Design a protein around this ligand. Structure first.
Ligand code: N6D
Lengths: 179, 177
């Protein structure tokens, strides 16, 4: 029961994270890259600073990580190995986190209400800032789910400890990368 | 229509996630406490003014001192939380939460929130603390902490029973208007 609730949350929240990134890329990002609307000169061609590597993070989750997490649905006690298999991919959160302060100041000092106008136009509950925090949230959250599984999975649970290791190391490494 | 960013900070032992879930679903989640509360917004009326309330959880970031402040800029009000039956979480208001919140957001209002009010009269909890030479945190202790940190309000609640819970977020909103 408990390991199943946790696995279900893992997957449900993974889908929502993929949906969330997708919405961010296709609304706030696309309005910059499109050429449909007038960009503030403050941010023109600065989408690399604003969004960091969120594209590459999204493609990881959407092309690989979600489909693999799904394969472990009936194998919650083994799901730590998914994090070990894909540990290298998570290093991209290190890059994301480093850029996040520069992203935020750029949006404040130089974007005016470009993104707010885009939010109203699309009718989004989440602001650009709310979307851009999500990768930071997500990456510190996997370790909470793994700890929960450890409280309710048997001696066959070194397939969780190694996963958690990796998922404690990634946010610490991103934390330690900050200026 | 006024938008309000409200960030919830404090130790893992406050039960930040459960607080937020209990608030937004109007129910203690009971069967299974979810670990994830995604950024949330909803319209609430307060003193006749409709308001869009934004709630961000921070659970998971308790050990990442440089990541946590990524959420702080442009917050309208903070809930600095501690559990009324964890003295160490109470002390961390002073040692950890207030300093960083203030460092990054000097003019943003703080509500001091004591969670787990239902566990403060609980024999088993109380006896567990007695065995460590500790007691639950009482009302004047939160009041004195609130005063020390510049908190606009000190409030106690239970997400189990809902007692004081809706008041918490009412008052976060009143702290901004
Ligand atoms: C005999 O009591 C059993 C029991 C078991 C599980 C939970 C509770 N109480 C709470 O969780 N109260 C909370 C939780 C948050 C968060 O804030 N207040 C009580």
């Amino acid at each position: 029961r408990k390991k199943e609730f946790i696995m279900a949350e893992l997957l449900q929240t993974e889908k929502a994270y993929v949906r969330d990134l997708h919405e961010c890329l296709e609304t706030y990002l696309w309005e910059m890259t499109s050429g449909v609307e007038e960009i503030p000169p403050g941010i023109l061609n600065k989408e690399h600073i604003i969004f960091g590597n969120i594209q590459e993070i999204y493609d990881f989750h959407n092309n690989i990580f979600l489909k693999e997490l799904e394969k472990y649905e009936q194998l919650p006690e083994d799901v730590g190995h998914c994090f070990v298999t894909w540990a290298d991919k998570f290093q991209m959160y290190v890059t994301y986190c480093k850029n996040k302060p520069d992203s935020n100041q750029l949006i404040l000092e130089h974007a005016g209400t470009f993104f707010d106008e885009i939010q109203q136009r699309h009718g989004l509950a989440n602001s650009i800032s709310s979307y851009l925090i999500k990768p930071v949230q997500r990456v510190t959250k996997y370790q909470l789910l793994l700890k929960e599984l450890l409280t309710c999975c048997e001696e066959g649970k070194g397939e969780l400890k190694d996963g958690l290791e990796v998922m404690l190391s990634v946010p610490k490494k991103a934390n330690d990368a900050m200026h | 229509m006024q938008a309000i960013k409200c960030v919830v900070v404090g130790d893992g032992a406050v039960g930040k996630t459960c607080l937020l879930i209990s608030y937004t679903t109007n129910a203690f989640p009971g069967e299974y406490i979810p670990t994830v509360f995604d950024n949330y917004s909803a319209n609430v009326m307060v003193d006749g003014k409709p308001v869009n309330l934004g709630l961000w959880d921070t659970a998971g970031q308790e050990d990442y001192d440089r990541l946590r402040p990524l959420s702080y800029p442009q917050t309208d009000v903070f809930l600095i939380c501690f559990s009324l039956v964890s003295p160490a979480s109470f002390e961390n208001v002073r040692a950890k939460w207030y300093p960083e919140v203030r460092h990054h957001c000097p003019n943003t209002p703080i509500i001091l929130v004591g969670t787990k009010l239902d566990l403060r009269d609980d024999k088993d909890t109380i006896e567990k603390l007695k065995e460590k030479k500790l007691t639950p945190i009482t009302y004047p202790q939160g009041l004195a902490m609130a005063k020390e940190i510049g908190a606009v309000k000190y409030l106690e609640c239970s997400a189990l029973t809902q007692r004081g819970l809706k008041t918490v977020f009412d008052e976060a909103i009143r702290a901004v208007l």
